[PDB]
Amino acid sequence: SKYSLAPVAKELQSLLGKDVTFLNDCVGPEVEAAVKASAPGSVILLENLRYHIEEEGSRKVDGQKVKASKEDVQKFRHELSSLADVYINDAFGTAHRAHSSMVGFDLPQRAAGFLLEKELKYFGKALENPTRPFLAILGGAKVADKIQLIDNLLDKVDSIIIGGGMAFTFKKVLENTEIGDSIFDKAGAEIVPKLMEKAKAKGVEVVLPVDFIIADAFSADANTKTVTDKEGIPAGWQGLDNGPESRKLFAATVAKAKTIVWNGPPGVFEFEKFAAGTKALLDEVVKSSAAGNTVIIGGGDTATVAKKYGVTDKISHVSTGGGASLELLEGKELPGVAFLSEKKSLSSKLSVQDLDLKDKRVFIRVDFNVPLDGKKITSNQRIVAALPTIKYVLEHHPRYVVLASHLGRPNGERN
Numbered sequence: 372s373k374y375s376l377a378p379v380a381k382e383l384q385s386l387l388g389k390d391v392t393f394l395n396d397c398v399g400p401e402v403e404a405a406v407k408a409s410a411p412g413s414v415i416l417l418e419n420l421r422y423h424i425e426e427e428g429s430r431k432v433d434g435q436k437v438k439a440s441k442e443d444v445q446k447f448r449h450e451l452s453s454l455a456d457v458y459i460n461d462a463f464g465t466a467h468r469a470h471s472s473m474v475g476f477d478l479p480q481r482a483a484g485f486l487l488e489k490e491l492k493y494f495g496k497a498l499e500n501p502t503r504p505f506l507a508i509l510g511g512a513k514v515a516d517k518i519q520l521i522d523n524l525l526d527k528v529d530s531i532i533i534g535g536g537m538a539f540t541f542k543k544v545l546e547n548t549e550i551g552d553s554i555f556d557k558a559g560a561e562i563v564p565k566l567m568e569k570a571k572a573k574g575v576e577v578v579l580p581v582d583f584i585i586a587d588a589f590s591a592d593a594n595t596k597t598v599t600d601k602e603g604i605p606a607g608w609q610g611l612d613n614g615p616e617s618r619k620l621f622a623a624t625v626a627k628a629k630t631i632v633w634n635g636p637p638g639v640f641e642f643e644k645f646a647a648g649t650k651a652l653l654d655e656v657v658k659s660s661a662a663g664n665t666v667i668i669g670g671g672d673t674a675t676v677a678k679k680y681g682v683t684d685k686i687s688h689v690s691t692g693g694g695a696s697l698e699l700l701e702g703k704e705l706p707g708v709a710f711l712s713e714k715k716s717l718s719s720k721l722s723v724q725d726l727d728l729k730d731k732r733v734f735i736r737v738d739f740n741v742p743l744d745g746k747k748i749t750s751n752q753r754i755v756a757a758l759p760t761i762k763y764v765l766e767h768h769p770r771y772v773v774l775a776s777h778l779g780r781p782n783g784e785r786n
Contacts, residue, residue, distance in 0.1 A: 373786055374779040378747045379739045380416040383754055383774075387761065389414050397775055398423065398450035406454055406732075406773060413771040414761065416739075420775055423447060424783030426471045431782065439783075448475030454773050455734030456480060459723050461760045462738045462776065463490040466707035467695040472736045472775055473707035481712050482721040484735065484760035486691070491708065493667050493688040494699040495717030497632055502665060503529055506628035507700075508621070508652070510535030510635030510673075514559030518566075520634070523702040525569050530576040530628065532621055534613060534637035534648070538580050542600060549603025551585065553610050578624050582614025584638065584645060591642045612638030613648025621648075625655040634669040634700060636676055649676055657685045669696035691738065691756070723760055728767040735760060739776040 380393030392409060396402050397417035409415055420426040425447040429438040448471045452458075458476040460466065461484025465473055483491070497505065507528040511517060514537040524531060533541055540556040542548040544563045570577050581600050585608040586593035597614050598604060613621070617637070625631065633656060640649035653676055660666040666686050668677050671693030677683045690696040698705055699717065712721030737757045741748040748754070764772050 373746065374419050374422070374781040376416060376419050376739060376776065376778050379741065379754060379776075379778070382748060382751055383414075383416065383739070383757075386751070386754060386758065387414060389765065391416050394418055396422070398447055403450075403453060406771065409771045411771070412765065412769060414765065414774070415771060416774045417776075419778050419781055420470075420472050421777040421779075421783065422781045422785045426777065427468070427783065428470070430784065437783075444471065447471050448477075451734075451775070452476050452478065454732065456731040456770070457482070457726055457728060457733045459484045459733065459735040459760060459764070460707055460711065461486050461723075461757060462707070462736045463487045463690070463695050464692045464738055464740070465695070465736075465777070466692075466705040467698045467703075469706035472777075474710045476734070479712075480726055480731075481710070482723050482726050483708075483711055484723050484737075485763065486738075486756055486760060487708075488720070488722055489688070490690060490692060490695070491699070491717035491720065494632075494669075494690070494696065497630055497665065497667055498527055498700070498702070499716075499718070501527075501630035503630070504628045505630045506530045506532065506624060506632070508532040508534065508625075508631065508633040508635070508637075508656075510537065510637050512536035512554050514540045514556045514563070518559070518562055519703075520697065520701040521566055522569065524632075524700065525566070525573055525575055528575055528632075530578060530624055531570070532578045532624055532637075534580055534617075534621070534652075535635055536610075537635075539610060541577075541579055545579075546600065548600045549605075550610070551604030551606055551608040553604055553608075576624070578620060580610075580613055580617035580637070580648075581620060582616045583610030584612035584614060584647065585609060586611045586645070591644060593644075595644055610638075611642065612645035613651065618648055618651045621652055622655045625652070625659055628659065628664060630665040630667075631656060631659060632667050632669060632700065633673050634697065636673060640676055640679070650680060653677065653680060653682065657682050660685060660687050669700060671696075691753070723763055728764055728769050731769050732771055732773065733764050733769040734773045734775065735764065737761070737774050737776045739774075740778050743779065 536554040637648040639645035
C-alpha cells in the first residue's frame with residue numbers, strides 16, 4: 372500500500388541497528404496484543420496514524436468534508452493512550468495541529484523530545500533574547516495572512532525585510548508605487564499603516580524592494596524585464612522577483628544582523644527565471660552564519676530553498692516545521708506544545724530527559740513523514756533526525772518503545 376510506513380520500519384532497523392517490529396495498524400486489540408507480546412526493550416513502529424480519520428479528526432470524501440464525532444475520536448485517543456506509560460512528542464511539524472497523536476494522551480508523563488526541544492529553543496532565544504541586530508526576513512504573496520506574524524515580530528526585531536508578492540501592497544500603499552498586475556491585497560492595504568506606525572514607534576527599519584523582475588505572464592517562460600519602483604510596473608506585467616538593487620539593499624541589511632529569522636523567499640524561486648533574488652538572499656544568509664551569526668530559516672518554503680541549493684549544513688537552524696514555525700513566529704501557542712509540560716515557555720517544557728523511563732512503555736510521536744517517489748523513501752533525513760530521542764529512550768531500559776507517525780495523505784483511510 373502507498374502510504375504504508377513499512378519501508379520506514381525497514382530503514383529505521385538498519386539506522387538503529389536494532390530490530391524494529393512493524394505493526395499493520397496503530398490501534399486495536401491486535402496492536403494491543405502484539406505490543407504486549409514484545410520482548411523487553413523492543414522498538415515497535417505502528418502503521419500510518421492518518422489511515423484513521425480521527426487522527427486529524429476529519430477527511431474529505433469527494434470534496435465533501437466528513438468530520439468524525441468527538442466520541443469516536445476520544446476512542447482512538449484512548450486506544451493510542453493504552454499503549455503507553457510515557458508520551459514523548461518529537462514531531463515539531465505537526466505540533467500546531469490539535470491532532471490525536473498530538474493532544475490525546477491523557478497522562479502526566481508527557482515530554483518533548485530532543486528535536487522538538489531544539490526547534491522551540493532556537494525560535495525561543497531568537498524571539499526572546501537575541502544577539503542584536505535581530506533581523507527578520509519575510510516573503511509571501513499575501514500580507515493579510517502575515518498580520519499577526521509581522522505584528523508579533525515588530526515587538527522584537529530591529530530590522531525587517533518584507534519581500535515577495537506581499538511587498539507590493541506595502542509599496543503601493545506607502546510609496547504609491549506603480550505596481551502593474553502585481554498581487555495587490557485590498558484587505559492588507561488597510562492594515563499596512565497601522566503596522567508601519569508600530570515599526571516607527573519601536574525603532575524598526577522596514578526594508579522593501581526598490582526594483583523588480585517583472586513578467587508578462589505568471590509562468591516559467593514569460594517575457595521578463597527589470598524595472599525600478601520609480602519606473603513602475605506596466606499593465607500586463609507583475610513583479611515575480613527581486614531586482615538587482617533590492618538585492619544589494621537586502622544584502623546590506625543582512626550584513627548588519629547578528630540574529631536572522633528567514634520566513635519566505637523574496638521571489639518565485641521555483642521558477643528558474645525568478646529565482647535570482649532568492650539565491651542571492653540565501654547566499655547572504657550563509658555568509659552571515661559563516662561569519663558566526665545566528666541564521667534560522669523557518670517555514671517549509673524557505674527550508675526548501677536551503678535544501679534546493681544544498682546549504683542546510685551552513686545554516687544555524689532550518690526548521691522542520693513549516694506551519695509550526697510560522698505559529699511560533701506569530702507567537703501562537705502550538706496545540707501540541709501547550710499540551711506539553713510546565714514552565715510555559717519554548718525554551719522550557721518537560722523533556723524526555725526529565726522523566727524516568729526504565730520499565731516504561733514509551734510512546735513516541737516521531738516524524739517519519741519522509742518523501743516518497745519510489746514507494747520507498749527518497750530522503751531518510753526525517754528518520755535519521757529522529758534517532759537521538761529513540762536511542763536516548765532505548766539506552767534507558769524501557770518496557771519497549773512504540774513509535775507512531777503519519778506519512779503522505781492516506782486521507783483517513785488505508786491507501
